[PDB]
Amino acid sequence: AVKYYTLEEIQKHNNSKSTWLILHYKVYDLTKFLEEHPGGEEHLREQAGGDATENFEDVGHSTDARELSKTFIIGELHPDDR
Numbered sequence: 001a002v003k004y005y006t007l008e009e010i011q012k013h014n015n016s017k018s019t020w021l022i023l024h025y026k027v028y029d030l031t032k033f034l035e036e037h038p039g040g041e042e043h044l045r046e047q048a049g050g051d052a053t054e055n056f057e058d059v060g061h062s063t064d065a066r067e068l069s070k071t072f073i074i075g076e077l078h079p080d081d082r
């Protein structure tokens with residue numbers, strides 16, 4: 001099951017450290033995808049450390065990517081943060 005991560009924790013993950021984000025309350029860790037993703041690292045890192053839901057959706061995404069997102073997630077932003 002998900003362990004949750006407070007935005008305090010999420011805030012620590014936005015560098016070589018690791019790159020987290022929040023898409024739809026769900027927390028992400030994408031520190032390698034930084035390499036592969038057509039956005040580049042910069043454009044994930046830019047958002048990274050939480051809430052990238054708006055950028056993710058304004059750009060928006062395919063099913064493929066939403067499915068990928070499951071194996072890029074680590075859990076949720078905690079309910080004591082939402």
Ligand code: HEM
Nearest residue numbers: 038039043044047052055056059060061062065068069072
């Ligand atoms: C959860 C991790 C994500 C995955 C699996 C992912 C996957 C992909 C894939 C497969 C594409 C091609 C378009 C498609 O068919 O969806 C793409 C394009 C793109 N992604 Fe992501 N992405 C993720 C998160 C993000 C986030 C949070 C951002 C930054 C705000 C972002 C920015 C972009 C941009 C800029 C494009 C191309 C837009 C254009 O065509 O100009 N992505 N991504």
